[PDB]
Amino acid sequence: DAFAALAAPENNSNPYEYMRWLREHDPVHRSASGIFLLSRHADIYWALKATGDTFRGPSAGDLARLFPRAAISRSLNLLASTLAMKEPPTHTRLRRLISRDFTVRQIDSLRPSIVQVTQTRLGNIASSLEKGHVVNLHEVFSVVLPMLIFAELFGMTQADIFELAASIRTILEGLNPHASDEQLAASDAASLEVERYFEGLIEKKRREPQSDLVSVLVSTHDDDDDKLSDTELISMLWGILLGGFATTAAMIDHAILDMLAFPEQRRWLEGDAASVKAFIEEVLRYDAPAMFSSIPRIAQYDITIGDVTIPEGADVRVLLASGNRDPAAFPDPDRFDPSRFHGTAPGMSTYGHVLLSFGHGIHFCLGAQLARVQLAECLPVINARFPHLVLAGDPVREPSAFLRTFRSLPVRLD
Numbered sequence: 001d002a003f004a005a006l007a008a009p010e011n012n013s014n015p016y017e018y019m020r021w022l023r024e025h026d027p028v029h030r031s032a033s034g035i036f037l038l039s040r041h042a043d044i045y046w047a048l049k050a051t052g053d054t055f056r057g058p059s060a061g062d063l064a065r066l067f068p069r070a071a072i073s074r075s076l077n078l079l080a081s082t083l084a085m086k087e088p089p090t091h092t093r094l095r096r097l098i099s100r101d102f103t104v105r106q107i108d109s110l111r112p113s114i115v116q117v118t119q120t121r122l123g124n125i126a127s128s129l130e131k132g133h134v135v136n137l138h139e140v141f142s143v144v145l146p147m148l149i150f151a152e153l154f155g156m157t158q159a160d161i162f163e164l165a166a167s168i169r170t171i172l173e174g175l176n177p178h179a180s181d182e183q184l185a186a187s188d189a190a191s192l193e194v195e196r197y198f199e200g201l202i203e204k205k206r207r208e209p210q211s212d213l214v215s216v217l218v219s220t221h222d223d224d225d226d227k228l229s230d231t232e233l234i235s236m237l238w239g240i241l242l243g244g245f246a247t248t249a250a251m252i253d254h255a256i257l258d259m260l261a262f263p264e265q266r267r268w269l270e271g272d273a274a275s276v277k278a279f280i281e282e283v284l285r286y287d288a289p290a291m292f293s294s295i296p297r298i299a300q301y302d303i304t305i306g307d308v309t310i311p312e313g314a315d316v317r318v319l320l321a322s323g324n325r326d327p328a329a330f331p332d333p334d335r336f337d338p339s340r341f342h343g344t345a346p347g348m349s350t351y352g353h354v355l356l357s358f359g360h361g362i363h364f365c366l367g368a369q370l371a372r373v374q375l376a377e378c379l380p381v382i383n384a385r386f387p388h389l390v391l392a393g394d395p396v397r398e399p400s401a402f403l404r405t406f407r408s409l410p411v412r413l414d
């Protein structure tokens with residue numbers, strides 16, 4: 001069972017050796033649960049692009065058949081009504097309600113806050129590091145920047161997002177096939193607390209609307225529940241919150257760790273916009289924040305791939321991280337090399353193969369530009385501010401079945 005392999009402590013630090021074995025010996029892998037896992041870049045790309053007809057989100061019947069605990073799991077039923085589980089026209093309706101605030105144009109208008117938050121945070125980080133303290137950069141920068149920026153966009157107070165960060169982490173870990181009974185229970189319970197917060201937040205924004213995404217969603221719902229039902233509203237709030245910062249923080253963590261691990265590639269962070277972006281794309285390819293997606297893709301046909309046949313109705317997952325290191329798509333895949341993404345469109349290598357960390361197709365990440373811009377603003381500043389930064393020991397990873405997140409990124413000045 002590949003999902004238990006990826007969650008095993010042995011493979012927590014570097015799971016790519018197992019992923020390499022999986023691509024070569026079982027690329028269309030059937031787990032013990034009957035869930036399939038695609039590890040080759042070309043198959044992952046096809047599955048993502050084919051979502052719509054060949055693959056769809058689960059119906060009511062699929063949900064009961066594949067997730068028998070669904071009637072009992074608050075987290076699973078909240079997921080079932082997010083737009084990531086839907087196809088057009090429903091998917092098109094939901095996405096258009098939220099896409100404006102994530103466009104290039106609107107993300108640009110956040111750059112002053114990103115700079116301000118970055119400079120304010122670093123000024124305090126510098127003060128502590130010049131005394132010779134050790135700083136958990138994950139805790140005091142990597143999570144803080146996207147939490148604050150997301151809260152501003154979404155309509156949450158900074159106090160709210162910090163109060164809920166622990167609930168978010170707990171919810172996220174229950175969203176994978178290897179989740180233990182305890183993790184699933186804890187996830188459902190935290191989803192309840194998050195849902196109660198949003199009930200309070202909805203009434204506040206109903207009575208006090210601002211230029212934030214939650215206010216737009218609530219007014220849309222209040223005006224016409226066929227544009228956004230009560231079920232779709234609460235799943236959207238819960239879902240966007242889940243996706244709003246945890247993976248961005250992990251990207252920042254990975255970027256800092258790559259900065260310190262490969263001093264030769266650090267020069268890319270000192271160049272023009274294109275050179276900085278190229279570094280960030282290679283961070284995303286080299287170690288995706290989500291190894292695979294919690295989102296099920298249900299086969300609408302028997303799908304024969306080589307000698308393996310995926311039966312109709314089967315849940316299929318995509319190992320984004322493995323496709324990112326597939327030598328058929330990225331030569332010398334274990335080399336960290338920003339030149340792959342220099343001068344090209346975002347996510348596209350100079351040889352025409354895409355990174356997969358943001359997905360592809362109808363469910364391509366809504367927040368990709370928001371994530372990329374935050375790191376493009378702060379990473380060159382970190383690099384210039386602290387040239388003598390080093391690790392003060394091994395980073396402590398958040399043990400996860402599928403997310404590549406950290407509990408600590410301990411640094412100090414040399």
Ligand code: HEM
Nearest residue numbers: 083084243244247248251293295358359363365366367371
């Ligand atoms: C580096 C940071 C991020 C990564 C690696 C990431 C990853 C992903 C992936 C892999 C998917 C597709 C999942 C699938 O197709 O099964 C996705 C979709 C999505 N992401 Fe991102 N995400 C990031 C940041 C964000 C942020 C900051 C937001 C802010 C709202 C966000 C919102 C969404 C939404 C709404 C979708 C669903 C889009 C749709 O179904 O049409 N993500 N993300």
Ligand SMILES: C=C1C[C@@]23CC[C@H]4[C@@](C)(CCC[C@@]4(C)C(=O)O)[C@@H]2CC[C@@H]1C3
Nearest residue numbers: 082084239240242243290292293294295
């Ligand atoms: C509104 C939503 C935002 C979304 C983005 C993708 C994200 C999840 C699924 C949470 C787990 C990690 C990750 C990266 C994944 O796909 O596994 C999240 C919750 C539900 C939907 C999709």
